A paper describes a structure:
Stalled ribosomes at the endoplasmic reticulum (ER) are covalently modified with the ubiquitin-like protein UFM1 on the 60S ribosomal subunit protein RPL26 (also known as uL24). In a pathway analogous to ubiquitin and other UBLs, post-translational attachment of UFM1 to the lysine residues of target proteins, UFMylation, is catalysed by an enzymatic cascade of E1 (UBA5), E2 (UFC1) and E3 (UFL1) enzymes. Collectively, we identify a fundamental role for UREL in dissociating 60S subunits from the SEC61 translocon and the basis for UFMylation in regulating protein homeostasis at the ER.
We determined the crystal structure of a minimal region of UFL1–UFBP1 that is stable and catalytically competent (E3mUU(ΔUFIM)) in a complex with UFC1. Comparison of the cryo-EM and crystal structure shows that UFL1 WH1 and WH2 superimpose well with a root mean squared deviation of 0.98 Å. The composite pWH–pWH′ domain and UFBP1 WH1′ show almost identical folds in the two structures. Moreover, the crystal structure reveals an N-terminal helix (α1) of UFL1, which is connected to pWH through a hinge. Importantly, this helix mediates multiple hydrophobic interactions with UFC1 α2. Single point mutations in UFC1 (L32R, I40R) or UFL1 (I8R, F15R, Q19R) designed to disrupt this helical interface abolish complex formation between UFC1 and E3mUU(ΔUFIM) and impact ribosome UFMylation without altering the association between UFL1 and UFBP1 in E3mUU(ΔUFIM). While UFL1 α1 binds to UFC1 in the crystal structure, no clear density is visible for UFL1 α1 in the cryo-EM structure. As the composite pWH–pWH′ domain adopts a similar conformation in our structures, it suggests that the hinge region that connects UFL1 pWH and α1 is flexible and enables UFL1 α1 to adopt multiple conformations to optimally position UFC1–UFM1 for catalysis. In the E3mUU(ΔUFIM)–UFC1 crystal structure, UFC1 Asp50 interacts with Arg265 of the DDRGK motif in UFBP1 WH1′. Although the UFC1(D50A) or UFBP1(R265A) mutations do not disrupt complex formation between UFC1 and E3mUU(ΔUFIM), these mutants impair both aminolysis and ribosome UFMylation.
Residue numbers in the entry:
A (entry chain C): 4 to 167
B (entry chain B): 205 to 306
C (entry chain A): -5 to 134, 138 to 162
Write the structure that this text describes.
Amino acid sequence: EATRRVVSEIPVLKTNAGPRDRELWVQRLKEEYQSLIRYVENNKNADNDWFRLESNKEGTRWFGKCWYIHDLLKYEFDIEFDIPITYPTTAPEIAVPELDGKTAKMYRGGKIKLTDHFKPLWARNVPKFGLAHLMALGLGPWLAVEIPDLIQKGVIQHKEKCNQ
Amino acid sequence: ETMTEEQSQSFLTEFINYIKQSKVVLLEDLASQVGLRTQDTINRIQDLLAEGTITGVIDDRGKFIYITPEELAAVANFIRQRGRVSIAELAQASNSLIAWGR
Amino acid sequence: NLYFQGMADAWEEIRRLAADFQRAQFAEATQRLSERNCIEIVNKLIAQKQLEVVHTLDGKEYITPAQISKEMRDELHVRGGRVNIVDLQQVINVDLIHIENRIGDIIKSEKHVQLVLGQLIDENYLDRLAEEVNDKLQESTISELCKTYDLPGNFLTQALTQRLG
């Protein structure tokens, strides 16, 4: 469905290697940043900038922010993930800690829980999907369902520096 | 609490001034300059647009854009040039069809 | 062992690319309007009678009446001079009323096209029918042909009247 459009715009990756491949990880990391850059540029070019991100010096730890807009209002959540040893075969697990307890589609630790459709698709495309594809096909669709829902259940509330 | 008819009206003055100086207004900055919730600033501005007192659009992210009549004209021509055009080819075109500044 | 040829150069590129990823995120976004806002404008233009435009059935596109007239002629051009009016809905993805509202123009204006029973037929179509029909005359019953081409007699006659020769 829609997927196809976002997928198409993101560059595929090639190196099948994870953090403990002495020789090939740095080549996978090069591919990770390149795709990421291109996704962000794409996101800026359309007026659709929905996140910020940073890594540790080895690209094994990642941390940042995302935001969702609902009824003209912005909700902003901190996020982070560690690259597994079995990456890129195994997909990394994104954590939004601030919603821990507050949403059913999430494990303890803030570890979000995706649809059943994600894993099979990740797996049939190994090693072409990377972090850009994670953001695009995992977190974002997760926000597009959970955030509206938590808002209408009063589980979350917009936050201005302020008072009526 | 809710705004005296007097206070309501310094709202509109502030707003006009921002539009006159910037053309595009971020509603969280308007809200802050007037000391209102973005929520209520937006809702107020929705009523003004309904009254016809104000002319413009609020994008999905809550930025306000005043569109000039020469712009409205250009949009009309652009649709007529194209004959058939998708709403998304429009949204794309808006970057060039509209000024984002004074 | 611990060093591999290129490792240094590779991590230098990562120093570069990571700095680009920050620069890219700090860059301002190209501004665009919501699709809703584009609709909002078009709805005003319509009110101010400054624009006449119809939407597609999937509500994804806008089309002017003149573009409809044009895409109508295109299908005729494609289909070869005989097209059913009913199929143009699907072809153009607009309600049939919007198509029907342009038929007056198509006929009068172009003068090249006529209307028969829910179908538009043009000079070309007939010219080429005549050819095939000559291919009976010099080799061999409008009655029959009217049935062979599912065309009303009144019409085909008048049309056949001005072809012979």
